[PDB]
Amino acid sequence: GLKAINNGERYQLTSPTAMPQSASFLWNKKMMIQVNCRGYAVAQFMQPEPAKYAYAPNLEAKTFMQPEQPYYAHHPGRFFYIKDEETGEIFSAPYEPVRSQLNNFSFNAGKSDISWHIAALGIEVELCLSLPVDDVVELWELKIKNGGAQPRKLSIYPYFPVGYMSWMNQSGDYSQTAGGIIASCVTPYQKVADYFKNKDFKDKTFFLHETAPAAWEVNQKNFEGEGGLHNPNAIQQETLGCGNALYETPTAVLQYRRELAAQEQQTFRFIFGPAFDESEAIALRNKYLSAEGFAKAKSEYQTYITSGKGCLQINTPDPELNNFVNHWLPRQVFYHGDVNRLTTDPQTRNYIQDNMGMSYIKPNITRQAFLHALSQQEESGAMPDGILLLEGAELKYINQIPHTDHCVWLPVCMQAYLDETNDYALLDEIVPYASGEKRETVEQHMHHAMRWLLQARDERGLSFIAQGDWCDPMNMVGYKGKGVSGWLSVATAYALNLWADVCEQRQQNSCANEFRQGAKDINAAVNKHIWDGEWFGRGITDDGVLFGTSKDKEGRIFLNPQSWAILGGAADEQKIPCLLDAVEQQLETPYGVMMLAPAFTAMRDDVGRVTQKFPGSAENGSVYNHAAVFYIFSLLSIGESERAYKLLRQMLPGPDEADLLQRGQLPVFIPNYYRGAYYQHPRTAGRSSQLFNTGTVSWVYRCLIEGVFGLKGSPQGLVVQPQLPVAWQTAEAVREFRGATFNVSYRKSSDIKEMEIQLNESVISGNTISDITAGATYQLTVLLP
Amino acid sequence: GLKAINNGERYQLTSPTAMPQSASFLWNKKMMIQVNCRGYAVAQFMQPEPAKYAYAPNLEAKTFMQPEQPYYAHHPGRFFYIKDEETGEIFSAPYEPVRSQLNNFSFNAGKSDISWHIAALGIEVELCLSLPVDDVVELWELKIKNGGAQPRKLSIYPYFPVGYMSWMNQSGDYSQTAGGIIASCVTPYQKVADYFKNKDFKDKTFFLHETAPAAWEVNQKNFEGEGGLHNPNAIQQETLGCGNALYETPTAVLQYRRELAAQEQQTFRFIFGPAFDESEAIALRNKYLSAEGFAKAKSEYQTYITSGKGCLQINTPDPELNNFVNHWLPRQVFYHGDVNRLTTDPQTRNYIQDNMGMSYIKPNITRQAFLHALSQQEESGAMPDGILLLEGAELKYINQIPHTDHCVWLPVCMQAYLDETNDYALLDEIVPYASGEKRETVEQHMHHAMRWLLQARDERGLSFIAQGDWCDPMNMVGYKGKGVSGWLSVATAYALNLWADVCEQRQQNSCANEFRQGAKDINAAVNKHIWDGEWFGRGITDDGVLFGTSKDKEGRIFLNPQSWAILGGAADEQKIPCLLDAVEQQLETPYGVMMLAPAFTAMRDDVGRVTQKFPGSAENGSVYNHAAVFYIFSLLSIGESERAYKLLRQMLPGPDEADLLQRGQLPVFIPNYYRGAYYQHPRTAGRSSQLFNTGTVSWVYRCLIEGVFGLKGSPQGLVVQPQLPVAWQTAEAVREFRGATFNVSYRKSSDIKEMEIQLNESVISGNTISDITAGATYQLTVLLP
């Protein structure tokens, strides 16, 4: 079974085998953890760069998680073994590593915690994980109850494998003074500069108990012996051996021996995490490891999540949609803008898009993000490929490979901020540039960005692509310096048209004319060179080849140039229906719209690395949700209400059982992708990546707020412009907007020919609520034909 | 049990649990594999840089093996499951992953193969692995026999897990045309230049059968199901499901169904390895996958190993020593010089030392190695930190961090070559330098190297250490440009004294004087600044601190400055006994001599990274065999015969049972280290690193040939100078030397006061056999007091 519980606070799966990849996530200001339903977990923290405290059993690469991450028996996880001392029978919570028969299983994804209930052998177990807001530590609460009528003698063994920490130096031992296990290493390196750089690393891992145990074991191999994780030798014997690790793989295993009366329950607390030294571990222990410490952290964390609850609560005829939107969407949006994906150098397009989502949650964060991003703009007007969030950080990985699209996001996402807040006064703030002495207003910086986009075009008037655009791995179209992007061109026309509208609102009329003319020039170039007759191509290679066209067998159509041609005006009214039909025919699937099709099955080396991905995975033809929601937004922009909703709703798994089993995910987030290549590889199509990091969700939230429910800001007030699916006879929403609350009731009427709006029971004229007082509540009734 | 079998060809362990880390190795011109006794394996190949075809289940770091490498259930390996179709009972060969009760177990390390015999359920299994000489492929032969009296219906399942190949693209499927499983990936990258660089990668892994199977499975998770590796679901059912992998972790599993008569045995052949494409896999199949192909490869491989058999066979009163020296030592030496550790940029000290070993095996390889190494000498005289073996290769890892000792090895190892071969004519060969147009003789290059060592000294006359010397991770003594090395100084005096002796043999008298004077100057500086009263210090830091002294609590004495002071002449007759005693008191252990003591337990940042290793591991205080044999060689140089032999013999595990169990290794190689820190951490002391890559063995072979058995070359012929341990009443050796064979019999006599030598039964005068005819055999009798 799989359903919402606890009044929306949690979401419960009752089989540990039906959906074995399913998972949920938690984060805080400094860490994140992905927890699998069977007890595997991946945890990363910042110090200030990424690191981990629970390691693989081998020397793993520097990485967090892969899409569709597979687990294996020794993957890091969070386990508790229970042993009936009378019978010798054992089981483990949550399910791994023993995989015993259980009488009851629940995995509960929470807004603020992750928990399990299980039962075996008549013993009832509860496990609850949460994090505090500001420190790196896991708070673990275990409850064990004898559910039967006679006393029961049990051994209870936390098993938190530390893994292979380092080939230079790893060890571990029990510390009575810390009250638990302290594993220790030295992170490997070779260069002297790295010794200086690594000085403040938290290269100890602690596992501390509140209640002193009977015994412990710190050596992984001693724990397993021949019995392995299925039946550890250390657990077969009466008492753990109390061994240490001396350049041996360390582990964290404790043992409690209890005789529990009928119906008796006992609670045990632990914390797990990294530390510089034992002193820091003890500081965490004193702050957190108690009933009071756990309750204070929980109260503070629930407060943090509620601070990010957002501006929209809905009550539609679709209860799965209600649950997702009300309870899960805003937390996922909030994570992205609040901690910027836990990177010290966010990709600029990610920083600006994730902060755009924040406009609906905590817009002062958005405001400061624009100020920060623009302070790092180059004097040319160009934006850097990443934005540094800490002095001393550097551009890493894809951010060192030249992509050309960074400036497009500025006005595209500023428009959401300005519409929601009406904070045009941001445009007057003064900020520096990345180099030089010039300090200019936001508005001037934006003009220089749009001038950059206009200058970074070839003689045909089309945008250079270099080693990629929005599609990060699209690296061989323009690497010789001549290739151009179809998508970047259409999106630059959109950006320029939006920014000209701002300039016109600001009385910057010369600018408005200049950018409007820019946008027409690009659109005309696009129509001349990129349009392929039934859809827009994707780009022109360094050697002059148009691709993403009907002559290409793989990558015959890409979604992005279509959505963005719709938004930026390259697609007129006669080309629009060609796009809709071609997308439906070639890209739509039951799991959502694919970003390109057919997927590439081999390298095409004038397009590049994207074509080497497995067909259907990631940018190579998946249902890549971020591209899908750009299409949904383009659809809303032209009033294609039914098609917009249909494709948005496809992003949420369930309630169809086959759908839920095939995507394999709990419906508590939208992943970066569901597997595509639907025609080529049907068996796997729909499978969830399980990756909760995705720019999709800022845009999905915007589409629902402003487009489907149609409650959008303007300089006059709240614009009522709903695009509800026709199946809905009635719906309600509660919209928070500029400090006020709107209780909106939507109802279909066959008495009217045109929408009618009532505010506090009086019919209004027009579609705008203009008189908004902070702290007030308004009743809005919207009757629709 | 653990013993030599097959007339020395193999070495057999009969418990899969007593020595669970034990392992043996195979190599060829392009690959190596370390095979664990329970069925785990690590395999690397060159194309021309390192790569693998069997992956971990996660995204592993670029690495081969760690010292004391731990395994875990999903580590790569080489397995076969047997299922009794009547009972459903299963077991796996060799032992993992099921770990069933077996009725018989043998793991056979071979000179040219690795094999197992096991039995369970009345079924007798044989497994044999070997490699061809020149292609990258594993040749696997499986035999299954019903050892009982009634027919038996069995399913037989090879299980060769491919692992997690790539996050960009991984897959696999069955190919009837190839006749087996083909897994495929694209190695991840981001930079366009890497696409060009990676073009010829063998990114397919094949598992091909000679005999067509009943069924197959390519998806790892489908193979395991809930049952895991202990009881795979695919094996529970009647027939494998014939599944593929589509961006899922692939595997190689086949199934044969057989009804075997009483006493019936069947043979099945497979090959496993990497390929560019199916065409290459089929080429390997046609060449190898047959009884004829396996026999041709085996015959060619045994020939290759016999070509490396070396120059010394011994018959001593110690049968463990005999076995090791005769059967295992020469193959380990041969590996090092023949394939240079499978790196395209060997560390210069490793290249020169490993090639020195070759002087006793195939000296033309040694000769060409000096020619190659010196062609890359810098015009200054300095040697580079590595030697490039392929055009386009680069210096990697430690070779990019400046170390100062590279030139010292030239005359130290040239001396062995000249003594063995008498090829002074090498000195006349003309070779270029790394830059510039100068082409000079070997002799001139050597003079420039020794002038470099003399110039690279401070005002005190001591050698700069920069970021390290022989001790690779000794990186913080001289990183600011002032620190100097105690060891490098004493070894430079040795190098100069040897090279002056060559110059004197070559009538280069000015050079002889110049370098002899250099050596005295350095030795005097060493005695003034480095000698600490009872032993020589290790170095002086940038801030002027002498370390490796009696005032240091950790790192109180280092072995190297003592051995090298003995060799180079810094240690006179009055200081020698102080060194011997201090080494005995502080560094000697039952497992061999430690390289420093007490081990460092925390960073000391004017010594550096070495001090951060776990105490007792690697350079931080292990029994680091390469340093140990430098001491043994220094001992032989002063006639400390008993102490030399004792410490050399300590390098060979066994026959003491406790010793064999504690080191945990088969006695078929000498590892780079046995764990030290004997006083600080007794529990783990002696544990083998299991690393067969080590420069130790060229020197151990030289010590036995020239020092213990005392059969050493000179410009006059064969010098007889034995240092046998006194316990030996008699011994024999067979020495191959300059094309002739010497059958040497050694016998102790109380009738003589001084050694007597007879050649073909006539007493000779002096200690040199001067008349050596190629192809002849001589009988030498050496009577000792």
Ligand SMILES: O=C(O)[C@H](O)[C@@H](O)[C@H](O[C@@H]1O[C@H](CO)[C@@H](O)[C@H](O)[C@H]1O)[C@H](O)CO
């Ligand atoms: O090859 C790769 O590493 C990966 O495919 C990344 O490019 C990708 O990264 C995303 O790829 C999007 C589409 O290319 C891009 O618009 C976002 O800015 C970037 O965060 C992943 O979602 C990161 O999890």
Ligand SMILES: O=C(O)[C@H](O)[C@@H](O)[C@H](O[C@@H]1O[C@H](CO)[C@@H](O)[C@H](O)[C@H]1O)[C@H](O)CO
């Ligand atoms: O920190 C490290 O990576 C390792 O300790 C290496 O330095 C070491 O490498 C050896 O270390 C020796 C002593 O330092 C050195 O003389 C040899 O040239 C070098 O091959 C290993 O034996 C490679 O397996």
Ligand SMILES: [Cl-]
């Ligand atoms: Cl795209």
Ligand SMILES: [Cl-]
């Ligand atoms: Cl040393």
